[PDB]
Design a protein around this ligand. Structure first.
Ligand code: MGH
Ligand code: ZN
Length: 956
């Protein structure tokens, strides 16, 4: 029948709740393809995943395949304009990214449903005939440098590369994947390399159809999608590349029984234990590493972590199999350390080996396998519908590992019980096979070695044989038991029939002094799941830095106390989130609705009768202390956002104020605060999902009754429901606040042009403006001017007020970044004047689609309502209202707006700038306007005191 297609392949197994339709196939040139038809979708999407990545970089050009990934976006033969692809997505409500791992390069986009073909045609050109323009290459090489720079002082990245640096140095594993200006420009020039050629050469060599999978998701039929994919992808050449394989483990004998002592950037204490294992991927139908992961990483009674945490040695643990590449994997067990734990690392590892030994002694357990199989089956059956862009990206990666027919199920379904494989993996978790890393600031000064790409400081030792031998003779230890049946496993999936009184938006079904209950029975998704959100108000949670600290610790203590019991709930797809806010606390319980009341009842009950174990108190207080200190090591752009938040909010305690007040938090003082906090509250709740009104009222009243029974709670008075205001900046003012980041050698800037209170029309002026400037801000400040990797723009909403912000992290100083942004704003007014009426309407259409995009799953719909409730705007039909209004706007409206509120000589410009300086300070380019001298903020309190505050926004 069809020369262009090798194979069609059978029905693709899907959940029976999945109304989308699917066709797998294989093109003549080798491309594995999944087509997904969703006739209701708002965005379409596609992804392409090439089975090549940085493990295949040339040894003399670290980061080449990552760099290539950047360059594919910057023009092809059919679409030579550098930003054709970006701007097309932007004008049709889409977005795109890409990533490169050791074996893959993965490219995906979404777009408005009726412009799939447009988007896909541009996308296909990436794989056919990229330009790699010489001038683009010179520019983009900075963005890749900047990306690396952002990672340099991050502990996760450093450990990630330290591991690669300590295996076999001639194994591809040890390569440097990101690349930087040095590896991608400086040194190749020094060595006579034409990088445009090396990119042409690599693309030509590795971008072979036989190494590619594609997924496309759209409203079209399967037949129409098929024709489409054949049309744009049959022409990719098959150069028949063998798939790279790495049968030899980068950790050989010389790499085993080694100890590493590493100095962190942040003040953290961790121990990483690693064993090399073979590639388990081919055993996916039984998944022996998941079985052992489930056991070793367990957190219930009888578990490894239970005992380490009781000895006061660790607070958290992670264990299980870790991806390597084709040919090798790892098995890891990593824990954080208390100060005691740091001195007992040897005993910790013995306990690990005792627990593994217990697994050997009891042997593989079919009922445990049975449990995971069941959980996986229920999860698969009732999986949330995914956002298109993530779904295609994720399936494109897995098309390389699974038969077409299984790609949806493979990662979920379990079919084979394999005590042999389990035994075989257990036989590698042995002291003679072990690598041990200790990350601690106590190693400062004591190290003698330095990792080349990140500068990490470490020491490497043989673990002494006395130590191996002691671990090899690990007896059983009776504190360690396998877990018992998981009683939280759900079994009731009945979907309650939709009630006669069901509304499309949440309804206020209870409005008392104690509690305000918003409710909606799910009428869209029909999965046996529910979301229960509660905001608890207490003035005592933020009355001062000390109380804030206590609110925090109280909740951390509570979570830590519930963990053993909650963990079973989590494996059963039932979880919770519990945190202190500047208003009091937030509690959310999400998941299968079956056993939800039980978990929820337990939490409130513990909350109200809580008894603190003081060793837990002391460990958590110390972790929190480190945690506040560690803020100093966050990125300059985060610092900028943090300072602006502190400047524009009526009330806010700084981390310094918090750390200072922390020494005063005693056990006595915390026991006193808890009943104080719970004595008067107000509760506002959204209960949303597979539940009825009457079950909702029941749950609300149960939460209330428990607080009353156990903590005597009474109502707050309507007047004590303080929501905080934003600072109101003067017409034509400009304020700068400046700080130094002490760890990172970039600077950060945030610029905020405050506009006015939120409301239908102020909202849409800002949003439309943001839409129009979005891609060009990126295209100009990043792609042309190459000011940094991080370059953001868009609305700021806080405390009912709003405005336009830019964020940039750069090597260049902030005074300079200011001026490039102002230069950019002029370029924007000129281009709004110059654009066609129709280009104008496309932006409207594009924002329109963004706003009207239906939530694909329960919790996305909850989040939307929840934001209407926490903001106290309660505007559930906001998207229709605001989109109706948006369709009436014109170029004259936006030009006016820009001229009123935004332009440099705007009558109502209100500008504030946070400059975060790098670790050590004290052309083709458009003209930047002359700026006024700013008012430099010296003291955040004086500043606020000296300014009006805005009203709060009226409801409805
Ligand atoms: C089945 O395996 C598991 O149950 C858990 C282990 C665990 C410990 N405590 C609670 N659960 N999860 C994992 O092992 C998770 N896995 C990550 C993932 O699921 O994507 C990993 O092992 C990777 C850990 C890692 C290493 C380095 C940097 C980031 C993350
Ligand atoms: Zn990148």
């Amino acid at each position: 029948n069809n020369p262009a297609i090798k194979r069609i392949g059978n029905h693709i197994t899907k959940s029976p709740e999945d109304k989308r339709e699917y066709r797998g196939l294989e093109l003549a040139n080798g491309i594995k393809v999944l087509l997904i038809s969703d006739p209701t979708t708002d965005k379409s999407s596609a992804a392409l995943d090439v089975h090549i990545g940085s493990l295949s970089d040339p040894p003399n050009i670290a980061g080449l395949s990552h760099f290539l990934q950047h360059m594919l976006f910057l023009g092809t033969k059919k679409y030579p304009k550098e930003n054709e692809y970006s701007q097309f997505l932007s004008e049709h409500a889409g977005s795109s990214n890409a990533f490169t791992s050791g074996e893959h390069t993965n490219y995906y986009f979404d777009v408005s449903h009726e412009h799939l073909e447009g988007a896909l045609d541009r996308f296909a050109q990436f794989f056919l005939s990229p330009l790699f323009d010489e001038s683009a290459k010179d520019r983009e090489v900075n963005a890749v440098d900047s990306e690396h720079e952002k990672n340099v002082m991050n502990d996760a990245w450093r450990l990630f590369q330290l591991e690669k640096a300590t295996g076999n140095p001639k194994h591809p594993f040890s390569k440097f994947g990101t690349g930087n200006k040095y590896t991608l420009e400086t040194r190749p020039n020094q060595e006579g390399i034409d990088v445009r050629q090396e990119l042409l050469k690599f693309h030509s060599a590795y971008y072979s159809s036989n190494l590619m999978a594609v997924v496309v998701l759209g409203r079209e039929s399967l037949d129409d999608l098929t024709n489409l994919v054949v049309k744009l992808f049959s022409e990719v050449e098959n150069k028949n590349v063998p798939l790279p394989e790495f049968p030899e483990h980068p950790f050989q004998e010389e790499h085993l029984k080694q100890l590493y002592k590493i100095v962190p950037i942040k003040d953290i204490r961790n121990l990483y234990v690693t064993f090399p294992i073979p590639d388990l991927q081919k055993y996916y139908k039984s998944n022996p590493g998941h079985y052992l992961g489930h056991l070793i990483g367990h957190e219930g009674p009888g578990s490894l972590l239970s005992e380490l945490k009781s000895k006061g040695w660790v607070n958290t643990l992670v264990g299980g199999q870790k991806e390597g590449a084709r040919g090798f994997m790892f098995f890891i067990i990593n824990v954080d350390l208390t100060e005691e734990g740091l001195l007992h690392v040897e005993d910790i590892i013995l306990h690990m080996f005792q627990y593994i030994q217990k697994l050997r002694a009891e042997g593989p357990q079919e009922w445990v396998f049975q449990e995971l199989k069941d959980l996986n089956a229920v999860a698969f059956r009732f999986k949330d519908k995914e956002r298109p862009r993530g779904y295609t990206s994720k399936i494109a990666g897995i098309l390389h590992y699974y038969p077409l027919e299984e790609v949806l199920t493979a990662e979920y379904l379990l079919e084979e019980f394999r005590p042999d494989l389990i035994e075989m993996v257990l036989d590698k978790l042995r002291p003679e096979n072990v690598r041990v890393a200790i990350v601690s600031k106590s190693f400062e000064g004591k190290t003698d070695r330095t990792e080349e790409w990140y500068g990490t400081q470490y020491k490497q030792e043989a673990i002494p044989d006395e130590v191996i031998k002691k671990w090899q003779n690990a007896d059983l230890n009776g504190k360690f038991k396998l877990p018992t049946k998981n009683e939280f496993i759900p079994t009731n999936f009945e979907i309650l029939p939709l009630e006669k009184e069901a509304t499309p938006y949440p309804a206020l079904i209870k409005d008392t002094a104690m509690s305000k209950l918003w409710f909606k029975q799910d009428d869209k998704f029909f999965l046996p799941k529910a979301n229960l959100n509660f905001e608890f108000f207490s003035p005592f949670a933020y009355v001062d830095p000390l109380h804030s600290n206590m609110a925090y610790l109280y909740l951390e203590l509570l979570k830590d106390s519930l963990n053993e019991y909650a963990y079973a709930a989590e494996l059963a797809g039932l979880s919770y989130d519990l945190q202190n806010t500047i208003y009091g606390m937030y509690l959310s319980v999400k998941g299968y609705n079956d056993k939800q009341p039980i978990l929820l009842k337990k939490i409130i009950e513990k909350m109200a009768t809580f008894e603190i174990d003081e060793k837990r108190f002391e460990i958590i207080k110390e972790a929190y202390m480190r945690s506040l200190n560690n803020f100093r090591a966050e990125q300059p752009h985060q610092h900028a956002m943090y300072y602006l938040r502190l400047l524009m909010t009526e009330v806010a305690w700084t981390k310094d104020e918090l750390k200072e007040a922390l020494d005063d938090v005693t056990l006595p003082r915390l026991k006193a605060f808890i009943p104080q906090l719970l004595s008067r509250l107000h509760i506002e709740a959204l209960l949303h999902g597979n539940i009825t009104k009457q079950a909702a009222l029941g749950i609300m009243q149960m939460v209330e009754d428990t607080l009353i029974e156990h903590a005597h709670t009474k109502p707050l008075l309507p007047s004590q429901l303080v929501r905080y205001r934003e600072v109101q900046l003067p017409d034509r003012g400009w304020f700068v606040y400046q700080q130094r980041n002490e760890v990172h050698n970039n600077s950060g800037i945030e610029i905020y042009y405050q506009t006015d209170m939120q409301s239908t029309s102020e909202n849409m002026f800002l949003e439309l403006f943001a839409q129009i400037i979005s891609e060009p801000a990126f295209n100009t400040l990043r792609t042309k001017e190459q000011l940094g990797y991080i370059v953001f723009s868009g609305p700021r909403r806080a405390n009912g007020i709003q405005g336009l912000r830019f964020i940039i992290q750069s090597e260049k100083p902030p005074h300079y970044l200011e001026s490039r942004v102002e230069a950019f704003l002029i370029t924007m007014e000129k281009s709004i004047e110059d654009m066609t009426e129709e280009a104008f309407q496309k932006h409207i259409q594009a924002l329109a689609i963004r706003r009207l995009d239906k939530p694909k799953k329960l919790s996305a719909e909850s989040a939307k309502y929840w934001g209407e409730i926490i903001s106290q705007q309660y505007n559930f039909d906001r998207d229709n209202t605001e989109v109706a209004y948006l369709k009436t706007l014109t170029k004259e409206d936006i030009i006016k707006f820009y001229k009123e509120m935004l332009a440099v000589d705007a009558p109502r410009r209100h500008k504030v700038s946070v400059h975060v300086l790098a670790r050590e300070m004290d052309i083709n380019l458009s003209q930047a306007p002359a700026l006024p001298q700013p008012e430099v903020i010296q003291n955040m309190t004086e500043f606020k005191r000296g300014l009006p505050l805005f009203p709060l926004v009226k409801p409805h």
